[PDB]
Design a protein around this ligand. Sequence first.
Ligand code: HEM
Ligand code: HEM
Ligand code: HEM
Ligand code: HEM
Lengths: 141, 141, 146, 146
Amino acid sequence: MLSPADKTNVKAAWGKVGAHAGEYGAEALERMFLSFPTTKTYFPHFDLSHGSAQVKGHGKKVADALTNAVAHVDDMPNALSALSDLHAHKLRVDPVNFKLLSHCLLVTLAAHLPAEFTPAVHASLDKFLASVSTVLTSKAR
Amino acid sequence: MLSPADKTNVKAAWGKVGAHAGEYGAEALERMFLSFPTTKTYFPHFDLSHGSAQVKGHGKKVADALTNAVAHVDDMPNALSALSDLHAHKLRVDPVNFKLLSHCLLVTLAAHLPAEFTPAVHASLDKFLASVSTVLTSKAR
Amino acid sequence: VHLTPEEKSAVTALWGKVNVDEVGGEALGRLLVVYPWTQRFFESFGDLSTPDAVMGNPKVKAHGKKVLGAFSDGLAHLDNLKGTFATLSELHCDKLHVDPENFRLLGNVLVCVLAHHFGKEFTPPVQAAYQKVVAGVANALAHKYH
Amino acid sequence: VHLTPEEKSAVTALWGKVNVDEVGGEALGRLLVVYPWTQRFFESFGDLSTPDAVMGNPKVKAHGKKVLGAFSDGLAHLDNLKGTFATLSELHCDKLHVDPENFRLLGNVLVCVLAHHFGKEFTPPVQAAYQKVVAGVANALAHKYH
Ligand code: HEM
Ligand code: HEM
Ligand code: HEM
Ligand code: HEM
């Protein structure tokens, strides 16, 4: 579970992401596609080329959802119910893939928040993405 | 999240284990050590030889806890708080290992409960061991 | 794979007792039931609504037999699963878009089915050898993904 | 691993810029902080009670340098990691009893540290090359487990 500390850490770093969330969301996807090629099997309908508008567009959606999770850090199961349902019943993404995106989201943040990406924040961010992944996969079966 | 049917299925299957739970506890460990030799890293102080009294004894211990979790299927978090603590702050097993033991427990059950190990029961037991795993790794960080 | 002659014989011998038809239909059905997200690839099969509906689906049964058939043929090439499954690896990637993690799930389901079927005969050491094979096959199938 | 020539150059170029002492201390410290269960192997290291306690612990810093030193050596034998890491593999298994999953966690932490340090220079494709490298090292280190 996220401690008060974790919560402060997350609001703080995400705070810093600000208006760049979309771009960082897109970058995390790109990093994931290149390092973990197997994740591409879920996007056969996408132009996965460098600077694809589809990826750009998709990156914004993912970032908006995370931003929404931060906004409702005390009620994530509810704030994300809709998205959990979508992932569980329509998309049917294998759970292991969540760990892959989370890692790539962390890399992206690290790469953009040198001052804020402290050991403590890194730990809180990791726990946060694990919590979000748990929610999105809770109704899988 | 275990559905009413799941809890039913688990209670039914475990009902049949009965006096053999300890033996099954033991055989599952044996299967684990053999199939996933990395799991042995957590038992350097045990004699891991076939039919070792240490393994037998530990098998019993694991079985009894699963029994207790079946009895409190509704209140797992509470029923295994002490065990969650032990594992989180003392044992400090990496969470990946929970999936390995779970699979070995399934295999063991399959091998011994032919009639009862239907597709529906297999799904429920899998979900169950997954929930037990979650509880046991929830205070890890 | 990194199978010992002893582990080799163990695999080989148990396999000769397998009814591929029944084991394949059950492994595939159990997969669809235990890990429901795997159903995403079989929309065209029909009613997968219930365990009973999956287990009974003839399309499921027949696909199970085809999958185990290819698996069965791979056991004749334990020293080159990679070359044995190269074309199937590309197909699963390039045409089917199947996440290789499914290969792993299927492998574990297969082991549960063998244990279910062979009870006593499916000893810890026999299971250890099968575990190496399912891992080897999944690895070979995922090998040409890009 | 599967390192294209251009992946091998990209790895090597960046590695040239790394202060192994510093990155070693940072990666090991962050591991103990993010995955506190990993602290299980360092009870003789003293105070690991808070993030500052970990990161500044002279013992953690020195061990980090040792580990990354061994890792840097591996980077010169990208052709033969299993060979290069065989005696260390045996040690981690037989004497230290270190679960190999720790090796993958450290790999991931290192990638985050490299991203932290290099910023934009740690491009998507440069990361893809490092991902292959840390996987290879983790595999090499786990190879002698039994
Ligand atoms: C914790 C991380 C994740 C978040 C916040 C997230 C969020 C979202 C959102 C907001 C959408 C768009 C829904 C809409 O159309 O309104 C989406 C769609 C989708 N997601 Fe997830 N997702 C996550 C993880 C994943 C992973 C790991 C995968 C696969 C590797 C995945 C595969 C998909 C796919 C295939 C779509 C549909 C895209 C399209 O066709 O436009 N998601 N996700
Ligand atoms: C299904 C999940 C599990 C359950 C219900 C479980 C249950 C238990 C129980 C009841 C004990 C004995 C506590 C006592 O002595 O009072 C125990 C101890 C222990 N467990 Fe867990 N366990 C599980 C998974 C694991 C896994 C996956 C590992 C490592 C791979 C593990 C490693 C240990 C160790 C090393 C001990 C101490 C053994 C000794 O020194 O006697 N456990 N566990
Ligand atoms: C032991 C692992 C597996 C083997 C050896 C295997 C083998 C095969 C074979 C031989 C075919 C025939 C198609 C052709 O030749 O054109 C096939 C098709 C297919 N497989 Fe795999 N398979 C495996 C695992 C899986 C899994 C786990 C899934 C999904 C959960 C999957 C999804 C499919 C699909 C969707 C098709 C196409 C069926 C159709 O055309 O209706 N396979 N596979
Ligand atoms: C990149 C992976 C790693 C490399 C190259 C590496 C390398 C080394 C080296 C060179 C030593 C000293 C050997 C000796 O004492 O003779 C060592 C010791 C040790 N390593 Fe590893 N290591 C790695 C990962 C890990 C991880 C992830 C852990 C645990 C989380 C770990 C736990 C230890 C411990 C406990 C010792 C002994 C410390 C002591 O002196 O008490 N290592 N390692």
